[PDB]
């Protein structure tokens, strides 16, 4: 399990550090990702197992990622109401590609005085029990090495769950009712044999050429509602 | 085909 800690209510301009712990994180590389209330996932940046740092361009000067021994930290440098969000830490899975196999459930930060586009199917999409639904994911520029694209399932208050990585590889332990397809700029998630418990928001997530823009991006999410 | 990983190897 990953666990995020340290979220609280702060006034604008008050530095705040969140922590990411496991129950051995020292071998793990970790990204920070946030989600404003009712909105989609947004990548902040990434720290390597030995401290190498990568940032989303929008996050520069707003977030500082560090680590030591048992913990990976995120300092929110000078917060504003723009930063009210749940913050997640996520471990990169096996290999060389940027996708995440484990998430925490998030920590909530509230701030108060008191060019990549990934377009998914519009929310909501309706599906009947026992049926089959397909979800689209189109990226404005191609994902790295053609196939570096993952899919996650997110339910309220729960860690996002990896379903598919490398466009079509089923994550460990996930139902084969989920199929990923596509390449380059165009991808699909197919849910076969729909069940009540498949009601969730689904996110695609690309790795991208770090010299062409940010190293990672997310689609806007597609909520599936089950009849 | 040349491969150009953008990240270090991850065992986890
Ligand atoms: Cl820079
Ligand atoms: Cl550091």
The domain that contains A165 carries what CATH number?
A: 2.60.40.10
**For tokens 């909105």, what's the residue?**
A39
**For tokens 């969730």, what's the residue?**
A200
d(CA A216, CA A98): 7
- Spatial neighbors of A136 by CB under 8 A, at least 6 apart, are A119, A120, A121, A186, A187, A188
- Spatial neighbors of A84 by CB under 8 A, at least 6 apart, are A36, A37, A109, A110, A111, A112
d(CA A99, CA A92): 5
User: Can you tell me whether residue A37 is helix, strand or coil?
Assistant: coil
Mutate to test the interface with B, among A48, A96, A207 (most CBs of B within 10 A): A96
Residues of B in contact with A94 (CB under 8 A): 10-12
User: Can you tell me whether residue A81 is helix, strand or coil?
Assistant: helix
Strand A125-127 and strand A222-226: pairing?
parallel
Q: Are A128 and A161 in the same domain?
A: yes
Among B6, B9, B12, beta carbon nearest to A144: B6
Q: Rounded to a whole number, what is the distance in Å from the CA of B10 to chain A's nearest CA?
A: 5
Q: Are A83 and A142 in the same domain?
A: no
Residue A114 C-alpha to ligand 2 middle, in angstroms?
A: 32
A111, A138, A154 — which closes off a domain? A111
Q: Are A47 and A92 in the same domain?
A: yes
User: Can you tell me whether residue A161 is helix, strand or coil?
Assistant: strand
User: Can you tell me whether residue A198 is helix, strand or coil?
Assistant: helix
Q: Is the peptide bond before A72 cis (omega within 30 degrees of 0)?
A: no
Q: Are A129 and A222 in the same domain?
A: yes
A63, A96, A111 — which closes off a domain? A111
Q: Are A10 and A89 in the same domain?
A: yes
d(CA A69, CA A5): 16
A26 within 8 A of A69, measured Cβ to Cβ = yes
According to DSSP, residue A97 is labeled S
A91 within 8 A of A29, measured Cβ to Cβ = yes
Residue A47 C-alpha to ligand 1 middle, in angstroms?
A: 15
Q: Are A158 and A89 in the same domain?
A: no
Q: Are A83 and A67 in the same domain?
A: yes
A62, A92, A111 — which closes off a domain? A111
d(CA A189, CA A157): 23
Q: Rounded to a whole number, what is the distance in Å from the CA of A96 to chain B's nearest CA?
A: 5
Q: Are A73 and A49 in the same domain?
A: yes
Residue B12 C-alpha to ligand 2 middle, in angstroms?
A: 19
User: Can you tell me whether residue A169 is helix, strand or coil?
Assistant: strand
Distance of CA A51 to the CA centre of its chain: 20
Question: What is the CB-side half-sphere exposure of residue A108 using CA atoms within 13 A?
Answer: 7
Which tokens sit at B12? Answer: 């986890």
Q: Are A28 and A129 in the same domain?
A: no
Among B8, B9, B12, beta carbon nearest to A91: B12
Q: Are A141 and A73 in the same domain?
A: no
Domain count along chain A: 2
Q: Are A107 and A151 in the same domain?
A: no
Q: Are A88 and A26 in the same domain?
A: yes
Chain B residue with minimum CA distance to A210: B6
Domain encompassing residue A155: 118-226
Q: Within an 8 Å CB–CB cutoff, is residue A97 touching chain B?
A: yes
Distance of CA A115 to the CA centre of its chain: 18
């Amino acid at each position: 399990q990953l666990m995020e800690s340290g979220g609280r209510l702060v006034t604008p301009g008050t530095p705040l550090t969140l922590t990411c712990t496991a129950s051995d994180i020292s071998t793990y590389s970790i990204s920070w990702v946030r989600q404003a209330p009712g909105k989609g996932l947004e990548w902040i940046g990434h720290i390597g197992s030995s401290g190498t740092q990568y940032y989303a361009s929008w996050a520069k000067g707003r977030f500082a990622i560090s680590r030591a021994s048992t913990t990976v930290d995120l300092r929110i440098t000078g917060p504003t109401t723009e930063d009210t969000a749940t913050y997640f830490c996520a471990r990169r899975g096996v290999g060389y590609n940027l996708y995440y196999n484990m998430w925490g459930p998030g920590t909530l930060v509230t701030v108060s005085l008191g060019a990549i586009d990934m377009t998914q199917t519009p929310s909501p999409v309706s599906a009947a029990v026992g049926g089959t639904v397909t979800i689209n994911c189109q990226a404005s520029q191609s994902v790295y090495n053609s196939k570096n694209l993952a899919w996650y399932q997110q339910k309220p208050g729960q860690p996002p769950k990896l379903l598919i990585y490398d466009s079509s590889t089923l994550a460990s332990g996930v139902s084969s009712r989920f199929r990923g397809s596509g390449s380059g700029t165009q991808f699909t998630l197919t849910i076969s044999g729909v069940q009540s418990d498949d009601a969730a928001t689904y996110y695609c997530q690309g790795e991208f050429s770090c010299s062409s823009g940010d190293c990672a991006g997310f689609g806007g999410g597609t909520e599936v509602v089950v009849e | 085909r040349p491969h150009f990983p953008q990240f270090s190897y991850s065992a986890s």
